[PDB]
Amino acid sequence: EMTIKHQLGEAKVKKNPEKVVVFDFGVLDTLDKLGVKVTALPQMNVPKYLEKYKSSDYQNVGSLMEPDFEKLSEIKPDVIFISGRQANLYDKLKEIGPTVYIGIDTQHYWDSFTNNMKLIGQMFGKEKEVDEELANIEKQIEEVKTKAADKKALIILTTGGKVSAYGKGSRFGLIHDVLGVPAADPNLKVTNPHGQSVSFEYIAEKNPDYLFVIDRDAVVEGKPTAKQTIENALVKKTKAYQNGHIVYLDPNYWYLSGGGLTSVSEMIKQVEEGLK
């Protein structure tokens, strides 16, 4: 048995749990990377890169925000992994089975990710494999930091033709904090998961060298809006647009997932491609 201290409390889990339930897609992609058998997940909306798990091979335990608590009672999980989207449901889930919070601390992204991945390693007897995969991600980080130098960036999320911004220490702060991309707005302190609502005027005025764009609507709705939103008078005149430095980050990772061995690796590859 393992005793796990996390941001929301403490859990007790058998090592090598057989019936694994996952509500965080970063953890799901970690288990997939390590070849750990998964029992169930919310299949209402699954990231494209994880569509293996949209299959009938797996039990459907609802949506990210609305678990199927009955179907969970029918499984009786050895462990339930949750992150931010389910934090408000910590107490209800804890009633059904061992429940581990495994979101990232955005103020300490690398250390929190490392801790989270090492817990997974310990739990499934995959300790050294995780240690090596973390090192391989670090090799990506050290290279990208050099390409990132001197390139002022802004991070935006688009939905419905409108935008929010994120900077240092935010949900998407790893672009600045981990990958060493300078912030076009250093005084932008954001903790809203949905970003700070901003205008196109704000983006134009900040006039970033690079604009990282995360299209919510591509994943939540099935209709891309990011290129339409960006194709706008105030953005089209930015350095970022004129220099071909609008970087459409894949929202299947950035919006729906993050914090896993595969997603963090792929997220860094997407940044690096954008900086190249």
Author numbering: 25 to 300
Can you provide the manuscript's text about this entry?
Siderophore-binding proteins from two thermophilic bacteria, Geobacillus stearothermophilus and Parageobacillus thermoglucosidasius, were identified from a search of sequence databases, cloned and overexpressed. They are homologues of the well characterized protein CjCeuE from Campylobacter jejuni. The proteins have a two-domain structure, with the domains linked by a long α-helix at the base of the fold.
The crystal structure of apo Gst was solved by molecular replacement using the structure of CjCeuE as a search model. There is a single molecule in the asymmetric unit with a continuous chain from Met26 through to the C-terminal Lys300. The predicted and experimental apo Gst structures had an r.m.s.d. between all 273 Cα atoms of 0.62 Å. In contrast, the histidine loop is already in the closed, iron-chelating position in the apo structures of the thermophilic proteins. It should of course be noted that these structures are from crystals cryogenically frozen at 100 K and that in natural Gst cells at their optimum growth temperature of around 65°C the His218 loop might well open up, as seen in CjCeuE.
